Specification:
Elements: E1 16-21, H1 29-35, E2 41-45, E3 60-64, H2 67-74, E4 80-81, E5 84-85, E6 87-90
Antiparallel strand pairs: 1-3, 1-6, 2-3, 4-5
Length: about 100
Amino acid sequence: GSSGSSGSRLPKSPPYTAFLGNLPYDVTEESIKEFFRGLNISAVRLPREPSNPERLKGFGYAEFEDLDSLLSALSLNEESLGNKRIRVDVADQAQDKDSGPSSG
């Protein structure tokens, strides 16, 4: 047996960040572009392990401009990418700013 429950609330306000899971080891930057082909992407987020930069972390995120982009992304929650299947869910708008000194 296995429970089942899900229901996220897309960010009514942009930008629209998409969350991907169960990504392969071949998933490259170009793969994300083609995966979301047709939609409007502003940038691709691909975090790498804090130790092995050559290896992917495990999750992928992409920035969108139009709302339709995110909607279509959810349809790729099953779409088999390469040799494995990935899931698409609504990602929380997690932002962070920093600052630095300066002399001279």
